[PDB]
Write a protein that holds these residues in place. Structure first.
Motif, PDB file in Angstrom:
ATOM      1  N   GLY A   1      51.925  17.988   6.263  1.00  0.00           N
ATOM      2  CA  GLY A   1      51.018  19.101   6.574  1.00  0.00           C
ATOM      3  C   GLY A   1      51.802  20.074   7.436  1.00  0.00           C
ATOM      4  O   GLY A   1      53.048  19.982   7.534  1.00  0.00           O
ATOM      5  N   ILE A   2      51.059  20.975   8.064  1.00  0.00           N
ATOM      6  CA  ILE A   2      51.637  22.028   8.854  1.00  0.00           C
ATOM      7  C   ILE A   2      52.581  21.463   9.947  1.00  0.00           C
ATOM      8  O   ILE A   2      53.604  22.012  10.220  1.00  0.00           O
ATOM      9  CB  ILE A   2      50.574  22.898   9.491  1.00  0.00           C
ATOM     10  N   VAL A   3      52.243  20.324  10.552  1.00  0.00           N
ATOM     11  CA  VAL A   3      53.027  19.824  11.674  1.00  0.00           C
ATOM     12  C   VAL A   3      54.347  19.334  11.149  1.00  0.00           C
ATOM     13  O   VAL A   3      55.423  19.552  11.757  1.00  0.00           O
ATOM     14  CB  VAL A   3      52.225  18.700  12.457  1.00  0.00           C
ATOM     15  N   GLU A   4      54.285  18.663  10.002  1.00  0.00           N
ATOM     16  CA  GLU A   4      55.507  18.223   9.439  1.00  0.00           C
ATOM     17  C   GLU A   4      56.361  19.399   9.002  1.00  0.00           C
ATOM     18  O   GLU A   4      57.554  19.406   9.210  1.00  0.00           O
ATOM     19  CB  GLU A   4      55.213  17.288   8.263  1.00  0.00           C
ATOM     20  N   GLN A   5      55.731  20.395   8.403  1.00  0.00           N
ATOM     21  CA  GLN A   5      56.456  21.553   7.913  1.00  0.00           C
ATOM     22  C   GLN A   5      57.053  22.388   9.019  1.00  0.00           C
ATOM     23  O   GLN A   5      58.199  22.859   8.931  1.00  0.00           O
ATOM     24  CB  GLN A   5      55.554  22.402   7.024  1.00  0.00           C
ATOM     25  N   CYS A   6      56.291  22.566  10.079  1.00  0.00           N
ATOM     26  CA  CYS A   6      56.698  23.610  11.045  1.00  0.00           C
ATOM     27  C   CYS A   6      57.097  23.091  12.379  1.00  0.00           C
ATOM     28  O   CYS A   6      57.794  23.764  13.119  1.00  0.00           O
ATOM     29  CB  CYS A   6      55.540  24.578  11.221  1.00  0.00           C
ATOM     30  N   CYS A   7      56.562  21.946  12.771  1.00  0.00           N
ATOM     31  CA  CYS A   7      57.043  21.391  14.022  1.00  0.00           C
ATOM     32  C   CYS A   7      58.168  20.371  13.832  1.00  0.00           C
ATOM     33  O   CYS A   7      59.191  20.437  14.516  1.00  0.00           O
ATOM     34  CB  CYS A   7      55.861  20.729  14.746  1.00  0.00           C
ATOM     35  N   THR A   8      57.927  19.362  12.992  1.00  0.00           N
ATOM     36  CA  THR A   8      58.914  18.338  12.844  1.00  0.00           C
ATOM     37  C   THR A   8      60.133  18.911  12.163  1.00  0.00           C
ATOM     38  O   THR A   8      61.234  18.792  12.662  1.00  0.00           O
ATOM     39  CB  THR A   8      58.332  17.218  12.022  1.00  0.00           C
ATOM     40  N   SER A   9      59.907  19.541  11.034  1.00  0.00           N
ATOM     41  CA  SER A   9      60.849  20.400  10.406  1.00  0.00           C
ATOM     42  C   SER A   9      60.591  21.848  10.840  1.00  0.00           C
ATOM     43  O   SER A   9      59.828  22.099  11.750  1.00  0.00           O
ATOM     44  CB  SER A   9      60.642  20.356   8.893  1.00  0.00           C
ATOM     45  N   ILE A  10      61.304  22.790  10.239  1.00  0.00           N
ATOM     46  CA  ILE A  10      61.167  24.162  10.648  1.00  0.00           C
ATOM     47  C   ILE A  10      60.546  24.954   9.526  1.00  0.00           C
ATOM     48  O   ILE A  10      60.681  24.589   8.337  1.00  0.00           O
ATOM     49  CB  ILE A  10      62.506  24.762  11.079  1.00  0.00           C
ATOM     50  N   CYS A  11      59.813  26.003   9.889  1.00  0.00           N
ATOM     51  CA  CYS A  11      59.217  26.758   8.866  1.00  0.00           C
ATOM     52  C   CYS A  11      59.372  28.226   9.162  1.00  0.00           C
ATOM     53  O   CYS A  11      59.551  28.638  10.317  1.00  0.00           O
ATOM     54  CB  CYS A  11      57.753  26.367   8.652  1.00  0.00           C
ATOM     55  N   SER A  12      59.262  29.009   8.104  1.00  0.00           N
ATOM     56  CA  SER A  12      59.275  30.454   8.279  1.00  0.00           C
ATOM     57  C   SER A  12      57.880  30.973   8.550  1.00  0.00           C
ATOM     58  O   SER A  12      56.890  30.284   8.325  1.00  0.00           O
ATOM     59  CB  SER A  12      59.818  31.086   6.991  1.00  0.00           C
ATOM     60  N   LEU A  13      57.787  32.227   8.952  1.00  0.00           N
ATOM     61  CA  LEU A  13      56.483  32.837   9.082  1.00  0.00           C
ATOM     62  C   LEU A  13      55.734  32.903   7.769  1.00  0.00           C
ATOM     63  O   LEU A  13      54.530  32.771   7.775  1.00  0.00           O
ATOM     64  CB  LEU A  13      56.617  34.245   9.584  1.00  0.00           C
ATOM     65  N   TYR A  14      56.414  33.157   6.643  1.00  0.00           N
ATOM     66  CA  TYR A  14      55.772  33.022   5.354  1.00  0.00           C
ATOM     67  C   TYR A  14      55.218  31.647   5.073  1.00  0.00           C
ATOM     68  O   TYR A  14      54.147  31.531   4.461  1.00  0.00           O
ATOM     69  CB  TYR A  14      56.712  33.345   4.192  1.00  0.00           C
ATOM     70  N   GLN A  15      55.940  30.580   5.427  1.00  0.00           N
ATOM     71  CA  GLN A  15      55.342  29.272   5.196  1.00  0.00           C
ATOM     72  C   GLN A  15      54.110  29.140   6.099  1.00  0.00           C
ATOM     73  O   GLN A  15      53.091  28.580   5.702  1.00  0.00           O
ATOM     74  CB  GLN A  15      56.311  28.131   5.456  1.00  0.00           C
ATOM     75  N   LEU A  16      54.166  29.661   7.330  1.00  0.00           N
ATOM     76  CA  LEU A  16      52.964  29.589   8.152  1.00  0.00           C
ATOM     77  C   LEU A  16      51.769  30.202   7.485  1.00  0.00           C
ATOM     78  O   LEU A  16      50.661  29.773   7.700  1.00  0.00           O
ATOM     79  CB  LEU A  16      53.146  30.276   9.495  1.00  0.00           C
ATOM     80  N   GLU A  17      51.985  31.229   6.677  1.00  0.00           N
ATOM     81  CA  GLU A  17      50.873  31.918   6.002  1.00  0.00           C
ATOM     82  C   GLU A  17      50.203  31.031   5.023  1.00  0.00           C
ATOM     83  O   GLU A  17      49.082  31.341   4.535  1.00  0.00           O
ATOM     84  CB  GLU A  17      51.300  33.166   5.283  1.00  0.00           C
ATOM     85  N   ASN A  18      50.887  29.930   4.686  1.00  0.00           N
ATOM     86  CA  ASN A  18      50.206  28.972   3.835  1.00  0.00           C
ATOM     87  C   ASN A  18      48.947  28.402   4.386  1.00  0.00           C
ATOM     88  O   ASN A  18      48.111  27.896   3.639  1.00  0.00           O
ATOM     89  CB  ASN A  18      51.123  27.828   3.492  1.00  0.00           C
ATOM     90  N   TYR A  19      48.778  28.519   5.693  1.00  0.00           N
ATOM     91  CA  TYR A  19      47.658  27.880   6.356  1.00  0.00           C
ATOM     92  C   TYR A  19      46.648  28.903   6.796  1.00  0.00           C
ATOM     93  O   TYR A  19      45.755  28.596   7.497  1.00  0.00           O
ATOM     94  CB  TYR A  19      48.129  27.049   7.556  1.00  0.00           C
ATOM     95  N   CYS A  20      46.779  30.136   6.314  1.00  0.00           N
ATOM     96  CA  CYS A  20      45.737  31.108   6.543  1.00  0.00           C
ATOM     97  C   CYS A  20      44.647  30.891   5.559  1.00  0.00           C
ATOM     98  O   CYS A  20      44.878  30.363   4.477  1.00  0.00           O
ATOM     99  CB  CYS A  20      46.263  32.525   6.329  1.00  0.00           C
ATOM    100  N   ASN A  21      43.470  31.319   5.941  1.00  0.00           N
ATOM    101  CA  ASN A  21      42.385  31.345   5.024  1.00  0.00           C
ATOM    102  C   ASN A  21      42.398  32.622   4.240  1.00  0.00           C
ATOM    103  O   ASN A  21      43.305  33.420   4.384  1.00  0.00           O
ATOM    104  CB  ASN A  21      41.086  31.061   5.783  1.00  0.00           C
TER     105      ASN A  21
END
Ligand SMILES: [Cl-]
Ligand SMILES: [Cl-]
Ligand SMILES: [Zn+2]
Ligand SMILES: [Zn+2]
Lengths: 21, 30, 30, 21, 30, 21, 30, 21, 30, 21, 30, 21
Positions: free
Chosen positions: F1-21
């Motif tokens: 999920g988001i934590v794995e994608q962005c905290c444990t691993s790294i994510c871009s701001l575009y990947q963060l947008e995956n979690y917008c509604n």
């Protein structure tokens, strides 16, 4: 640089002022 | 005042605090 | 991305997120 | 400038990106 | 833009930044 | 999920947008 | 607990603190 | 909604808790 | 250092940065 | 007091330092 | 509500949240 | 103290209230 000074090592608020313009 | 570890966004927040209107540069690459 | 309304330190945090390892300069007026 | 624009008006991440080193 | 580690409240702050008015969900359990 | 994608691993701001509604 | 006056990202941080591992959804108007 | 209420008025942690997953 | 305009939690973060390991007390009116 | 002063007016880091333990 | 690790400025931010107008003390030395 | 309770170990929001005035 700043990260080494203040994150990796510790810095004072005065040392932080080193990075003001 | 104190000496502490300031990292990441906390480091830039501290720079904002310390510098304010002077502005500042955050250049982690050096 | 959405437009941003950012004041004070919120702008600095946004700059930090946007610029990552490149870092940034924060340069207010006056 | 950007610091004022983002606060008194709005600004985009893309405008912000101009301030990266 | 960059790729970075975003954790905890910083992650949700980044989501706020990125999503804004769209809103977002933060679901650490998956 | 988001934590794995962005905290444990790294994510871009575009990947963060995956979690917008 | 006390009542809260929370705008912008401050609300998101409060949601983060309140919901912990459950996470939360942030759903502004419009 | 809650995002507006907390900002234009006040809101409680208990009201916030309703927005957890 | 520059003068500060700090409201809400921003004041608490400033106190945290200023006081470091000494900690601090936060004492609003009323 | 300081909490009000910093918000409605301005305050210095030095004034803040008075609130450390 | 949840139990989480709250450290550093996040701890004081949480105290601000929880205590608000009551105020609080942050005394890391004990 | 608070750091041991809430940072080193974990604490609830109610335990945090222990440190309110
Ligand atoms: Cl951290
Ligand atoms: Cl604010
Ligand atoms: Zn943090
Ligand atoms: Zn704020």
């Amino acid at each position: 640089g700043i990260v080494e000074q203040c994150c990796t090592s510790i810095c004072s608020l005065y040392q932080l002022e080193n990075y003001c313009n | 005042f104190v000496n502490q570890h300031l990292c990441g966004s906390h480091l830039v927040e501290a720079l904002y605090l310390v510098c304010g209107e002077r502005g500042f540069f955050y250049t982690p690459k050096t």
